[PDB]
């Protein structure tokens, strides 16, 4: 979940 | 002008904390999902005449718009009080579980019944056959029927946002790390919805369970969305947009 | 004697009775086991499929009897009565079998006492859906729903104005409203120290509908694995 | 069409 994890920690 | 005197003017208790939560959910929804009245509509003429297997042209637009609305749903989630207080793993688990459910709910609030159309966040307006050809396939009639069933509830942005929030913040999702903390987040969301419905529709008492049951319809539909992901994967050249795959895995 | 309280108690009572006289309770059943493929999962055990689909057929007959006892159900059009039964059949079957789950033995018990373990439930035909159904049955056990709640939930699932192709969806919508009100009053009477049990219990239907959708897909794959037709009543319900 | 469900209803 590379994208999702990035959007969530963004 | 003058507001004439009615009869039996409703009383309600103080619910100041839930009032503010209700306002926050409303703003979060509105700011991550424009309303039909604030959208400038436009059509295409691509395969508006008859149903096809997949309009490969409409699917490009639909999937890109879908990508963008998943981003908006992550933004909406981050604005619900407490959501970012959960572990990243639970945030991901909650979003993956509810994404398609919320996306169905959102697109059904963009249904224009006279025209038999749905309108996307850039204004793109497709009729029923075009929604079919865009990738809805055998689920078109089920989604359009749900959208029609929503109309007599006359939901507004507050109820739509509160229902989305409740669908996302659900302690029943499998593989949650702190499911009891998620349950605690959800309880004031259920309360706010119940109080809002009472205040707005004082003359219709059964509306809270009736609106709650719509979630159970959403899950019936998104449960079939998985099976469609696999059908679509074989019809499209190349890959599914990667964020869509992360949400459907 | 306030009127709607009186009417809702009348409704609550006949739905508990309808469920009780059409679905025996776990403590009333003399359990017995079988050793048919109970230790390793197989694609299908034909002997288990036969017994299980026979017991399912008999419970669908009881589900029809249950429906005929719901107030107003036989006032609907014939086609709507048929449409609602087909659309809720698996929902109510799932709900019924989950009330028959024994956690320590990891078993489900059929209305003749047959008690199958998780592997046997798989081999009988659950197949890939087995852990999902068993997980759902463990999530319901803490709630400890009695016959009234299970009857009311089954009635709510059956009398549902959002099913495709009803001829009088509005009449069915209205018929569901007292069922929702009766469940809410009953939960509040029974679970006083528990705030949001009405929404919690109600949204368990969400799980039912998900599982039942998957069970409809399972019917398709099962037909390719059974060297024969399913019982005709199951064929009819699953169209 | 199947006959069983209708016969069960009429029961
Ligand atoms: C996980 C991604 C979900 O998005 C969708 C993906 C899919 C579907 C629908 C949606 C929805 C409901 C999109 C809504 C978009 C909006 C509301 C756009 C906008 O505001 O602009 C169906 C047709 C069920 C089949 C399966 C796939 C994966 C192709
Ligand atoms: C998704 C899984 C759900 O479980 C089921 C799956 C299926 C079926 C029924 C059930 C249930 C819940 C049976 C319950 C029987 C009872 C309650 C018997 C009794 O009290 O004696 C039928 C209709 C037989 C065939 C198709 C599949 C395999 C999909």
Residue numbers in the entry:
A (entry chain F): 630 to 639
B (entry chain B): 160 to 408
C (entry chain A): 170 to 408
D (entry chain G): 629 to 639
Quote the authors verbatim.
All trans retinoic acid (RA) and its synthetic analogs, referred to as retinoids, play crucial roles in a wide variety of biological processes including embryonic morphogenesis and organogenesis, cell proliferation, differentiation and apoptosis, homeostasis, as well as in their disorders. These pleiotropic effects are mediated through retinoic acid receptors (RARs) consisting of three subtypes, α (NR1B1), β (NR1B2), and γ (NR1B3) belonging to the nuclear hormone receptor superfamily. RARs are modular proteins composed of several domains, most notably a DNA-binding domain (DBD) and a C-terminal ligand-binding domain (LBD), acting as ligand-regulated transcription factors by forming heterodimers with the retinoid X receptor (RXR, NR2B). To provide structural evidence of LG754 activity toward RXR and RAR, we crystallized RXRα or RARβ LBDs in the presence of LG754 and of a coactivator-derived peptide.
The crystal structures of the ternary complexes with RXRα and RARβ were solved at 1.9 and 2.3 Å resolution, respectively. LG754 ligands could be precisely placed in their respective electron density in the two LBDs as shown by the experimental omit electron density maps, confirming that LG754 can bind to both RXR and RAR. The crystal of LG754-bound RARβ LBD contains two complexes in the asymmetric unit and, while the two RARβ molecules superpose very well (rsmd = 0.410 on 201 Cα), LG754 adopts a different conformation in each of them. In both cases, LG754 is stabilized in the RARβ LBP through extensive van der Waals contacts and a network of ionic and hydrogen bonds between the carboxylate moiety of LG754, R269 in H5 and S280 in the β-turn. However, the propoxy group of the ligand points either toward helices H6 and H7 or toward helix H12. Both ligand positions are compatible with an agonist conformation of RARβ LBD even though the orientation where the bulky group points toward H12 might destabilize slightly the active position of the activation helix, thus explaining why LG754 is not a full RAR agonist. As a consequence, the tetrahydronaphtalene group of LG754 points toward helix H12 in RARβ, whereas, in RXRα, a rotation by about 90° around the C9-C10 orients the ring away from helix H12. A first indication of a possible binding of LG754 to RAR in a RXR-RAR heterodimer was brought by electrospray ionization mass spectrometry analyses with a purified RXR-RAR LBD heterodimer that showed the presence of two LG754 molecules per heterodimer. Together with our proteolysis and transcriptional assays, the resolution of the crystal structure of the LG754-RARβ LBD complex bound to an LxxLL peptide in the agonist conformation definitively proves the binding of LG754 to RAR and that this binding can induce an active conformation of the LBD. By doing so, LG754 allows for an efficient CoA recruitment by RARs as well as a moderate CoR release.
